[PDB]
């Protein structure tokens, strides 16, 4: 649906009702339908974290596998094998089509030039915390669609909300 001129920016993230994304390096839950979720939607893409986020994956997936993993940092000796380490958020969204995968301070610089939202909302009460990671604030001009609650396998609630905007 993009043109390959263009520049499409969207961002994904899982969420607690509370707005919770991210606490103690790592997100507070474990939800394999949402994993399945995040991969299909990303897959083939050039992938944007932030450092903290790249030190939050599993080494098992750590570069995230079959995306073109782009880390920013103002470390210019980091570490990260099998990534690429950019300075700014202008040299990591030079792709037609980027996805921004957390976290919270990563949401917050992408979301101005965002038009695309992937949201999971995991219905999980875990309250906000200090020092947690949160998801970001969207406005009155996005829109979109609210999917139907659904059980994991475990009898976690979830839903799948797919927001856009102009
Ligand atoms: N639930 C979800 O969907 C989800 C998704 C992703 C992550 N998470 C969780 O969120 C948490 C991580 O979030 P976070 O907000 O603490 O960190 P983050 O956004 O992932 O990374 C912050 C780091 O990015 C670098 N950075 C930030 N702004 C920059 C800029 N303008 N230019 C260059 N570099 C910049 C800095 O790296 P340097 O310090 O190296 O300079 C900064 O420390 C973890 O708990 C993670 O597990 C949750
Ligand atoms: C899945 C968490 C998540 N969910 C949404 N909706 N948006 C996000 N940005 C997001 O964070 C992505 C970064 C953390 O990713 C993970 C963390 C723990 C376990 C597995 C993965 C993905 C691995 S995968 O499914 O992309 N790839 C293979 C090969 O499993």
């Not at 969207?10 to 339908?33: F, H, K, M, N, Y």
């Not at 893409?45 to 790249?54: P, Q």
């Not at 917050?108 to 038009?115: C, E, G, M, R």
């Not at 939202?117 to 219905?123: I, L």
Request: glycine content about 12%; hydrophobic content about 40%; proline content about 6%.
């Amino acid at each position: 649906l993009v043109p390959r001129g263009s520049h499409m920016v969207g961002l994904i993230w899982a969420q607690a009702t509370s707005g919770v994304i991210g606490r103690g390096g790592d997100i507070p839950w474990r939800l394999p339908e949402d994993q399945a979720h995040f991969r299909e939607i990303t897959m083939g893409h050039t992938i944007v974290m932030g450092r903290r986020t790249w030190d939050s994956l599993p080494a098992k997936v750590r570069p995230l596998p079959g995306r073109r993993n782009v880390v920013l940092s103002r470390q210019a000796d980091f570490m990260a094998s099998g990534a690429e380490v950019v300075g700014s958020l202008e040299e990591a969204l030079t792709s037609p089509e980027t996805w921004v995968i957390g976290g919270g301070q990563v949401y917050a610089l992408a979301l101005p030039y965002a038009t695309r939202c992937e949201v999971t909302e995991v219905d999980i009460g875990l309250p906000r915390e200090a020092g947690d990671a949160l998801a970001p604030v969207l406005d009155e001009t996005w829109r979109g669609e609210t999917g139907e609650w659904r059980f994991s396998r475990s009898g976690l609630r979830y839903r799948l909300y797919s927001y856009h905007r102009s």
